[PDB]
Amino acid sequence: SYNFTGTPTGEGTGGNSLTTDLNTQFDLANMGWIGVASAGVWIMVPGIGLLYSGLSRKKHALSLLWASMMASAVCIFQWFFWGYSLAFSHNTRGNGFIGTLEFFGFRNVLGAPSSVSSLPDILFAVYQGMFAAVTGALMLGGACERARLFPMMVFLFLWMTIVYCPIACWVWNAEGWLVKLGSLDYAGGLCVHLTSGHGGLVYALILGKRNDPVTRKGMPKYKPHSVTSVVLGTVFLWFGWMFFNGGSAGNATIRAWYSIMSTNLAAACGGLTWMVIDYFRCGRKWTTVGLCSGIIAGLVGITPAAGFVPIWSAVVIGVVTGAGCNLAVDLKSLLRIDDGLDCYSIHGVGGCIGSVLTGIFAADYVNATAGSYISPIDGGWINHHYKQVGYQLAGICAALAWTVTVTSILLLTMNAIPFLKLRLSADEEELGTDAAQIGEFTYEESTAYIPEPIRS
Amino acid sequence: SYNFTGTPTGEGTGGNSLTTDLNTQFDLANMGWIGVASAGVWIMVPGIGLLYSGLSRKKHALSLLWASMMASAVCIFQWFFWGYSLAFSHNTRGNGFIGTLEFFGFRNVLGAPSSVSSLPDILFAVYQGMFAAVTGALMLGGACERARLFPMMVFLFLWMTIVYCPIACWVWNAEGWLVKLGSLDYAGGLCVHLTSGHGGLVYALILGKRNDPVTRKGMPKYKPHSVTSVVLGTVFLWFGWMFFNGGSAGNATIRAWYSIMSTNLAAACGGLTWMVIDYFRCGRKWTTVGLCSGIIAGLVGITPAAGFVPIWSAVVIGVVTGAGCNLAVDLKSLLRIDDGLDCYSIHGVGGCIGSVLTGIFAADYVNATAGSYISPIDGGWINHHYKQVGYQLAGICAALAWTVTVTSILLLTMNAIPFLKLRLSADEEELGTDAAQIGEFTYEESTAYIPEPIRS
Amino acid sequence: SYNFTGTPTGEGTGGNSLTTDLNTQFDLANMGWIGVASAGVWIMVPGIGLLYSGLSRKKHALSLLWASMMASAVCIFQWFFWGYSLAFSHNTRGNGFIGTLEFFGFRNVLGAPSSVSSLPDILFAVYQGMFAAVTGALMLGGACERARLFPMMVFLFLWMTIVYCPIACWVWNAEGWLVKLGSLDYAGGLCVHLTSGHGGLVYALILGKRNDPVTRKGMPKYKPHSVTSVVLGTVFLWFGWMFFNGGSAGNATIRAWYSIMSTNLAAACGGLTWMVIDYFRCGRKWTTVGLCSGIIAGLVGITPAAGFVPIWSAVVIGVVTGAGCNLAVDLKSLLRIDDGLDCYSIHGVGGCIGSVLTGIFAADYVNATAGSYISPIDGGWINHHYKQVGYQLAGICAALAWTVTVTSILLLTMNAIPFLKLRLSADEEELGTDAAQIGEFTYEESTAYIPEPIRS
């Protein structure tokens, strides 16, 4: 047999695999789960394209299902480049503000325990990358209207680098200032949904058609480009979500399965709530994207709460986030803008309803179901520890002020450069073109090239 | 460091999460597999939508693929409400006929050995919850022509409470009475396929178009609304069925993988059997829904058997089920109904053909591969325990009489209330016309409401 | 409790399961991960049907997505029949050239430790059978134009028997002659990709339409039947590939997750490389299938490498395989053949690029991360051992010589038996130009029978 004669470092590379069995630090069952979960979280990336392409009331030229592969490629590459480092490095340079570049090019990402200690660096980095790929596929879907492909890549890269990563460092790193503060966030109310959501708002305001003919009064609330596309994307997203929330436990203990039950319940309820609110708000008619929008809403709602709150409380978290989001979509008719408040009214707002409600129903008797793997939490309002709701709004503010600020800067800087302008203004574009090659899901038959925006 | 000081209870909640590592009664590898097996079982719900929406010789007003997220949401919620309780509670009400309401609202559910002791309560409930949502979707597809969406919600919820859960407790509860009798049903050939399949038959005979014109002598047998929908339906369902059967072993032992192999070989032979039977019955032409209909008929046939029967017998089961089901589709041209019997000829007849054949080929040596996790079965007819076919037939008839009677009562009772009758009669309806909105998979571009039947 | 009073045998059936707990030889977590990864690999089979039906510049009468359940059904069966035997028999019939038929009809495959000792036969046979079905699908892929269905079945069954199974014996069976020579092939650079690729090249030269109109000078290089098919096929494939490669570790150790991170990075870099090359070769226009084709190319290139090479080299293997496969599609316009050098230029050419570059970057310390489960390697050029590239080339030439020789003998044989002729010549064919029923994915609506070639 191959015999080892060394002890794991518990730092850096984690040890020498030639002389040290780095797997003894970890459980094979915890790894075999978070490994499968990784593959499962990724199938949410094309589910996010299928959803928001299909929900949109404007045909997009850049197919969002198609683009979601480019979102995978430049996010998987940004994560390898310096992404995993800037977020989840073992050493940070602030009050815990952003990581260093010790993990550039995935240098020394091998077998040391991560910020989740039940898992080696390389398995955590794989898992957490899909979270980035998910988020960056959302940010893509909020900013895809009349987008240009290469400035879209550059935008995504830079956005993930200077917006998602520092916020992930705050919330999920073992040394992030919001983790020390007390901000609870299971699977990314703040990191994935609040970030992508509000950059979707910051898109709507800075770019994106103002005074949009699709938002005029008396124009329908739902005119979906493809119902099928909305329903397929929810199948992938709901399925992928059991792994998104399940694996955030970091292990295979009761806590992971407790949080999948909370995840599906808050889905069912959030769905059934939206479906029905719309039934009344639309006059005894059953909406066609009503259910599916509700399902997603209740899933964003329970994202930050999944591994903290009681099962019954999920029902509450799904109903409030369903309703709150159903009403939030109506904000499209006050600004008279469409792009891309679709992403905002479900992820930005659902992210906030969730991160608060998280700090209300947060129980210690749920979190301890990870037993032996526990990183103890003080409790929430249902535990008579009342000041947790402030620790959440602290997270909600930092993650919001930073996204809303830096995304604004990023878009406007990219706008001053003609070579990188994300979206063209109508006076530049060859407006009105052979855009009949879209395309229920992607593009019409024998379409060899994507119909990109041109100028003059 | 943090330590735990208290022994698990083995009753009720099974322990105090805060003074008992509840996990120490279960293997993290067993749990992590039934956890992912859950999410896998769930992706069958829209597969059932797709497969029967697309196999239909009729445009359905209610898109089955759409209606499957609705069948997820009211089943997940019914499971949480009192579903897990009525079917799987630790104490039964007399003889082992139904469970108590001790798990109402998922009160008192976690870290306690369930009815499969290798799994806690909260995980066996998540896993088994998906089996509910799969039968909900099958009851849907059989009972959905001209169906109204809100009676259909109310119908599932009720059908799932007074038909599924009692038969579930009979066969899968530790204390159930069909367990004690000797009835073998690995993964639901009694609970899932025979019950939803026969609620299809009950639908065809009570509601659903009598003397349907699609069934006249000379009119074609197959004529699929959408072949793609059938095939992507089979893709999901087969994917799919591997966790459905594989996780029913309750553990990750050799037994799980012996039963995944039997699953795919029965599918492979159900498929080729139906496909080649159709080739000779249709005058030497390869049908478009023959292969996929045999794959599902074969997967149904092996469903009660995958964990007891030798691999080689999966061939015998796939070939006989796919044949018997092929004939059972011809039942439509004798009854002159359709509405109906697709969800019956595959699941109803398949579930029966399956469960009888489990009594004939069950082997003591195959069940035993579970190792230190076994419940030792005497075996079946090839172990010369002739008395097994009878216990299987005893299980069929118990499950068959309680479904035909209570679905008949539930459909007639509901047929008497204008607020809730599932399907409007031919005279109070108003055809068509919204077909121009259906829909290869769901609904046409920019549809906003589902074309619910309204009365004159 | 049930007590076990026997010891595992090591051979045949592994022991009597009635008196031995065969599970004690194996780790549940390892078995669990490779069991889920089985079903994950399966979903790659319709991905190959979706991907190559959409890439085609010719619309095919036999839908690859439809026929991919046929590839699945007859490959499962050929595995049960004698495929697992011929490839992974414990006793190879000299000198590690092909197995025996000791596992015929899956006799004795159960609990013995397989050719990967950390997994029982029955689980390793399930898992590896999916690699077969992936290959049978890729071989159906490149040989479907104007294919006849029953000859297509018989061709797959024999091609899987006398071409896939020997080569799998040589490089994967524990006693195989390329194993003991030194050839590294992690997850199927030779057995899966190089074989089916080169079988496409052999088809294209022998049966494919010579002097095809779609390849005359100035005819577009890309004219995809369906961008949506290409994108959905990549979603299933890229999801499934994480289990394809990750499960090739044979276990849940850090080597499995290290290999999944290589897999994704090479995909990402293969997609962007092709996408950017296409951009500059098609004159500043972004190709509609470029990004995806490079994703599949990169996943092909890293297939033999994933478990042996440093993460950073996945960038190199991705760019070189992306670019190399790009160039190779231009071969269609030198031979003036289309069907079916689509499969050749990604799988054939990517197999060889991948397997060579595996010998250059194999690293003893990456392989060593499986810790207690390794058979150590010297490594390749970067460990300063230069014999490894030799062993790679030896494996390439054996695999290439065999499939190019035997596929030709097999195609030319069948092509001389009127009723087994795979593809009718344009002079005996009826040429019913009813391509009107050939849909985007499968068949149009109410299509009933597949359109098989007939003769005047």
Residue numbers in the entry:
A (entry chain C), B (entry chain B), C (entry chain A): 2 to 457
Q: What did the published study say regarding this structure?
A:
structures of the Mep2 transceptors from S. cerevisiae and C. albicans. function as ammonium receptors/sensors in fungal development. a central channel for the transport of ammonium. non-phosphorylated, with channels that are closed on the cytoplasmic side.
The Mep2 protein of S. cerevisiae (ScMep2) was overexpressed in S. replacement (MR) with the archaebacterial Amt-1 structure (see Methods section). the otherwise highly similar Mep2 proteins of S. cerevisiae and C. within the N terminus, intracellular loops (ICLs) ICL1 and ICL3, and the CTR. extracellular loop ECL5 of a neighbouring monomer.
